[PDB]
RNA sequence: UUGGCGGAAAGGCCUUGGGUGCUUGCUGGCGAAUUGCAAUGUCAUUUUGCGUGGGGAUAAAUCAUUUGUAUACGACUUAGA
RNA sequence: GCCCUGAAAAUGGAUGGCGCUCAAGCGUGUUACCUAUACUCUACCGUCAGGGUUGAUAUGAUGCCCUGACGAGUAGGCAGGCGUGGAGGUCAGUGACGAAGCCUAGACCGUAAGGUCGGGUCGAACGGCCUCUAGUGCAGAUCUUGGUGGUAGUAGCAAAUA
RNA sequence: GGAAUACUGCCAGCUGGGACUGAGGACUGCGACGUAAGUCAAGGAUGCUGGCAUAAUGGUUAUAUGCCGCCCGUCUUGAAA
RNA sequence: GAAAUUGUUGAAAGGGAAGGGCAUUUGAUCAGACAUGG
């Protein structure tokens, strides 16, 4: 209507890492309204998808989309791990992305 | 058009350039072993280039197959070029570099007749 | 100072053997897919079973020796959910691990398990 | 010669499969799809649209209508995984249901006029229905949308 | 959530403050901090001055011009302390830097925005009371900062707009929940209390 | 301190308008001749 | 469109006045499919170039020359329709 | 006990850094959590070991197949390989319809040494396999010779009256 | 006096969510469900549906971004020195 | 007619060196895979 989306708020915030070496392969995700290991498991195993724009057109379009599922829980506060298809630029950091309500267990 | 085979997997793709063949134009970054003592790249220190060891080693399956599944053969002639008869779904021929355009029409002729696949036809190839 | 250990419950020897259990034949470590395999080995001793080898062990018994001495030593994965301690090297009784822990092996090992 | 000639080569027979033993069982479904169930589509053409679940079909999809007639939904397939399943049922007693199967969608437009019919026949028996509780026409006829807050986590639909 | 979230510096702890800003921006989050010279510090004037006296002491010995800088106003004091937690001298800390904007004071865009505050950071939630805390603003003024007055000046004309402001944003309220009552006994209502509303 | 407006009066001595320029003989000397429509329209702008 | 208030970076805030479009406050009548069981998606927002339709305006500066309140060279400062 | 005095050095400066005061300090307890080339599971390369198998029906018994364990490394040892000049043998090998060389931010193969191909430039020779043989592999030696840079349009081109 | 509850421990108790993996390639094994015909999750993934040739996808290369990475060679107990 | 080194043109980058490793966005560039009734 006023407001169209299907999907939950999101932010990539870092990659993988120890203190001084970082595991691009998996991103470290915070969710909005998602405060603690216990709710971030309804949203693990979801896919997640990061939007982004070029100049370039793949179809009519100038928008393209990185998908990943949702893998595990990070931490005490909510953090979700995940993983996508091609690894998220690093740029990403501190950028929006879009996990989705679906695969839907409810 | 070959035999199956499981998906081939590379395990190195990159090209272990010799240290520092970067750094000084008369380093050939043709490979070659760090025997120095103080050497960061051969005690391995983090950061480094990595360096060639057997681990890399192709899959015994999947190794020498090109992307297309034929290990390649190399051919000079006619003659040669029916060693692959057989083994089409094995081999693919490919035209040596100094054969003449020529013969180049006349060994893909055969291939094509005989069902042999040759890696490098378009070879001196006119118009 | 290298070990921390204790003593087993039955679930304990039971689970470390249906999952880990292998077993030496000519060096080869071997798993204990059929009591077939035990059989073949053990047999001489009795102990056709892989429960057979289970009971040999926890009751001990006469044949302890070799019934355990088949048995391939047990590789096992680090805790899961930690170790309890924040420091391992320190004696069960002070700050736990290493060293002689009675019955809490059990909690352990599962948890290796 | 180029090359030198293998001592070897390999067959070039193609080797048998070896017999798989997965059998294909049935499908458990998840308890909060029964039929009559009103769904929550979450993907594809019609994501967003509430509509309303029929039949297990056995190609594992879920039967669909809606009905047309209210949120222009028509008979149709959908996966079970892309549903949220929500709390508020239409009794299905009315609804034939038998005929629809998976051959029935099996790809043969012009929309057939056996298919036209049938959203016809079927949502005769929903709306009917649908119409029985105050709302639930308007319910149907919206879409489902995240606003600022809601918690999928928390939200119970 | 919100695109730009506007602090009121005023009784927050500065470096609890600047702790939690600093990831803001590294998350994304953008952040404007107003009042910037009503933020207080833990210790005693006293302390908190010479504190600032030896951060004052270095400079590049040949020449003072490329040593530490010390920039006296309350806002860069503060940045200090937040820039410090970023990591700076990378391409993404400047961005997340960049993020941030600070003022003393509440300027223009700002005055009329909604601010809120930071619990965590706040210095009557989380000191204990008896510990003695400076007054940035203060401090600020004794190291050299020019400004305080005429900042404070045109606070308190701030003060009173934002009054009258309210005065009228009140008493429509009123206007508003005067006019709410025969609904408030209204079917509609108990329609709505039944779910909640 | 920040400069919020200047004003300036309607007649500039050329004395002023020399100091405007770099190369004064060769230029048109615009000068303030459009400010000056400021006073023509009989008030105003200046006064505001 | 009428008025006010706003100089901290006010460039926004309150207001009149009519015109016009919608309104889910409520009651009707139609449409949606086959985009085929998800991959596809609303177009935002920056600079810049072609263009058309009318509005408005009609400079300097550098070089060379020149002064010595200046000057190693640049620079500085004067002078010349 | 904690804190305070005791408690004086030379560039400006370091609990790693910001900064922290019912701590983001000190003592103590209890849980959750983070991640090593380590541990567990699996795929792949190699090494070592044990076992089966030309009873065969082609194309390798130095094979083919099954199984288990293992993998740090200077000086150093050994192995299996890559590459260059020449030599016997062989492909009745390649080639003026273009050999060799060279150039290719082009392709493929090999863990690697390396091998192969396309395109360009080129002009008269050259390669594969089996062996033989060495004046056989370079980044250094203030190495040798030859060529070329930055320094740099820079130091300078101001004694001997014009 | 009769329970309940905590705590520790066992179940060859029943179930929901996520992740990675699918090595092998006719049959030979050990089994389980069977009154039986036979069926199976029992010595390693199959079934189903869809999507891609102006191309999905994969290689290289340049640039960017996160983290990391001191000059080799040599002697030396110890060299980026 | 190689290299050092140099001119022009084209492309890209550039806040007190540069070059390297892993990963990925972006661009450029290459590819292997298409025959079954008309
Ligand atoms: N060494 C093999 C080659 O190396 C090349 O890269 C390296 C060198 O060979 C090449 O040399 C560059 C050259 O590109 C460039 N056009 C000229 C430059 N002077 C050379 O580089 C040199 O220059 C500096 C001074 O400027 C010297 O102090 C220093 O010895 C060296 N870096 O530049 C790189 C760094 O010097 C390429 N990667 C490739 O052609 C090949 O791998
Ligand atoms: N963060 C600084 C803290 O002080 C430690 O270091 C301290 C000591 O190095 C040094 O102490 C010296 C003393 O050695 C020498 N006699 C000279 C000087 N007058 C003393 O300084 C001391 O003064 C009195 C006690 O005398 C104390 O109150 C004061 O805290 C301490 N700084 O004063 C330093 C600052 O207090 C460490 N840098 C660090 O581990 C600790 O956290
Ligand atoms: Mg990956
Ligand atoms: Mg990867
Ligand atoms: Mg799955
Ligand atoms: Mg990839
Ligand atoms: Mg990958
Ligand atoms: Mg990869
Ligand atoms: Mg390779
Ligand atoms: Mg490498
Ligand atoms: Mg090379
Ligand atoms: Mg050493
Ligand atoms: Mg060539
Ligand atoms: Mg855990
Ligand atoms: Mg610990
Ligand atoms: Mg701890
Ligand atoms: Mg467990
Ligand atoms: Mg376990
Ligand atoms: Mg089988
Ligand atoms: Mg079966
Ligand atoms: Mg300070
Ligand atoms: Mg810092
Ligand atoms: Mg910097
Ligand atoms: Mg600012
Ligand atoms: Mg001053
Ligand atoms: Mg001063
Ligand atoms: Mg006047
Ligand atoms: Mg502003
Ligand atoms: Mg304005
Ligand atoms: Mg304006
Ligand atoms: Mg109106
Ligand atoms: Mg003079
Ligand atoms: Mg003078
Ligand atoms: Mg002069
Ligand atoms: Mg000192
Ligand atoms: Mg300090
Ligand atoms: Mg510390
Ligand atoms: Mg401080
Ligand atoms: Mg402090
Ligand atoms: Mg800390
Ligand atoms: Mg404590
Ligand atoms: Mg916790
Ligand atoms: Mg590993
Ligand atoms: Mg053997
Ligand atoms: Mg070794
Ligand atoms: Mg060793
Ligand atoms: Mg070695
Ligand atoms: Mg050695
Ligand atoms: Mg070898
Ligand atoms: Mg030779
Ligand atoms: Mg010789
Ligand atoms: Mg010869
Ligand atoms: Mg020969
Ligand atoms: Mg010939
Ligand atoms: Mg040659
Ligand atoms: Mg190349
Ligand atoms: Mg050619
Ligand atoms: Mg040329
Ligand atoms: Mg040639
Ligand atoms: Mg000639
Ligand atoms: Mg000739
Ligand atoms: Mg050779
Ligand atoms: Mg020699
Ligand atoms: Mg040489
Ligand atoms: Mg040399
Ligand atoms: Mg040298
Ligand atoms: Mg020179
Ligand atoms: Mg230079
Ligand atoms: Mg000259
Ligand atoms: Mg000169
Ligand atoms: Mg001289
Ligand atoms: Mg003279
Ligand atoms: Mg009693
Ligand atoms: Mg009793
Ligand atoms: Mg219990
Ligand atoms: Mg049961
Ligand atoms: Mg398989
Ligand atoms: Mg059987
Ligand atoms: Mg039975
Ligand atoms: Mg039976
Ligand atoms: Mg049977
Ligand atoms: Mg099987
Ligand atoms: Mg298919
Ligand atoms: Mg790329
Ligand atoms: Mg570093
Ligand atoms: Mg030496
Ligand atoms: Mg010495
Ligand atoms: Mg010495
Ligand atoms: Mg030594
Ligand atoms: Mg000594
Ligand atoms: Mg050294
Ligand atoms: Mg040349
Ligand atoms: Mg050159
Ligand atoms: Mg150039
Ligand atoms: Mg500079
Ligand atoms: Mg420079
Ligand atoms: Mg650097």
């Excluded at chain 2, 103080?38 to 899959?59: A, H, L, T």
């Excluded at chain 4, 996966?79 to 043969?108: D, L, Q």
Aim: no cysteine.
């Amino acid at each position: 209507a006023e407001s169209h989306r299907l999907y939950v708020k999101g932010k990539h915030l870092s990659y993988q890492r120890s203190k001084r070496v970082n595991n691009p392969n998996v991103s470290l995700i915070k969710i909005e309204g998602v405060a603690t290991p216990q709710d971030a498991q309804f949203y693990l195993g979801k896919r997640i998808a990061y939007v982004y724009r070029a100049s370039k057109e793949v179809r009519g379009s100038k928008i393209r989309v990185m998908w990943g599922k949702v893998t595990r829980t990070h931490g005490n506060s909510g953090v979700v791990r995940a993983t996508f298809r091609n690894n998220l630029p690093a740029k990403t950091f501190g950028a929006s992305v879009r996990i989705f309500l679906y695969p839907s267990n409810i | 058009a070959s035999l199956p085979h499981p998906k081939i997997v590379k395990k190195h793709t990159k090209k272990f350039k010799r240290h520092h063949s970067d750094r000084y134009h008369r380093v050939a970054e043709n490979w070659r072993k760090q025997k120095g003592i103080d050497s960061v790249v051969r005690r391995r220190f983090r950061g480094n280039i990595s360096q060639p060891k057997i681990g890399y080693g192709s899959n015994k399956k999947t190794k020498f197959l090109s992307p297309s599944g034929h290990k390649t053969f190399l051919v000079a002639n006619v003659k040669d070029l029916e060693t692959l008869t057989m083994h089409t779904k094995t081999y693919a021929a490919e035209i040596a570099h100094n054969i003449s355009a020529k013969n180049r029409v006349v060994i893909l002729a055969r291939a094509k007749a005989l069902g042999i696949k040759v890696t490098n036809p378009k070879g001196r190839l006119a118009l | 100072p290298y070990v921390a250990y204790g003593y087993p419950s039955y679930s304990t020897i039971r689970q470390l053997v249906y999952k880990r259990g292998f077993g030496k034949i000519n060096k080869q470590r071997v798993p204990l897919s059929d009591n077939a395999i035990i059989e073949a080995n053990l047999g001489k001793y009795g102990i056709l079973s892989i429960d057979d080898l289970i009971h040999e062990i926890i009751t001990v018994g006469p044949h302890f020796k070799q019934a355990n001495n088949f048995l391939w030593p047990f590789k096992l994965s680090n805790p899961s959910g930690g170790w309890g301690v924040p420091r391992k090297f320190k004696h069960f009784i002070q700050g736990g691990s290493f060293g002689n822990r009675e019955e809490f092996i059990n909690k352990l090992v599962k948890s290796m398990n | 010669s180029a090359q030198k000639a293998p001592k070897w080569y390999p067959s070039e027979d193609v080797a048998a499969l070896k017999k798989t033993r997965k059998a294909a069982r049935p499908q458990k479904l998840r308890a909060s799809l029964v039929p009559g169930t009103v769904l929550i589509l979450l993907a594809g053409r019609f994501r967003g649209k509430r509509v309303v679940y029929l039949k297990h079909l056995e190609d594992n999809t879920l039967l669909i209508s809606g009905p047309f007639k209210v949120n222009g939904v028509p008979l149709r397939r959908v996966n079970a995984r892309y549903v949220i399943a929500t709390s508020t049922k239409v009794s299905v007693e009315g609804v034939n249901v038998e005929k629809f199967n998976v051959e029935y969608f099996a790809k043969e437009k012009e929309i057939k006029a056996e298919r036209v019919e049938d959203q016809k026949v079927v949502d005769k028996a929903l709306i009917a229905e649908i119409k029985k509780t105050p709302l639930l026409k308007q319910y149907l006829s919206a879409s489902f949308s995240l606003k600022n807050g809601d918690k999928p986590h928390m939200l119970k639909f | 959530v919100e695109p730009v979230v506007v602090i009121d510096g005023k009784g927050h702890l500065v470096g609890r403050l600047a702790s939690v800003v600093a990831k803001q921006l590294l998350n994304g989050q953008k952040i404007v901090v107003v009042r910037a010279e009503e933020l207080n510090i833990s210790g005693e004037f006293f302390r908190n001055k010479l504190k600032y006296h030896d951060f004052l002491r270095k400079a590049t010995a040949f020449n003072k011009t490329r040593g530490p800088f010390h920039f006296r106003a309350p806002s860069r004091i503060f940045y200090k302390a937040l820039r410090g937690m970023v990591s700076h001298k990378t391409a993404r800390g400047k961005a997340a830097l960049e993020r941030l904007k600070v003022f003393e004071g509440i300027p223009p865009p700002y005055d009329k925005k909604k601010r809120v505050v930071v619990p965590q950071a706040l210095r009557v939630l989380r000191l204990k009371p008896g510990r003695k805390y400076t007054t940035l603003g203060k401090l600020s003024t004794s190291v050299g900062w020019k400004y305080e007055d005429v900042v404070a000046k045109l606070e308190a004309k701030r003060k009173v707009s934002s009054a009258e402001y309210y005065a009228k944003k009140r008493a429509f309220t009123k206007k508003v929940a005067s006019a709410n009552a025969t609904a408030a006994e209204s079917d509609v209502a108990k329609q709505l209390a039944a779910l909640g509303y | 301190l920040r400069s919020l407006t200047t004003v300036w009066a309607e007649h500039l001595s050329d004395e002023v308008k020399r100091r405007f320029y770099k190369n004064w003989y060769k230029s048109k000397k615009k000068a303030f001749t459009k400010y000056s429509a400021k006073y023509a329209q009989d008030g105003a702008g200046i006064e505001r």
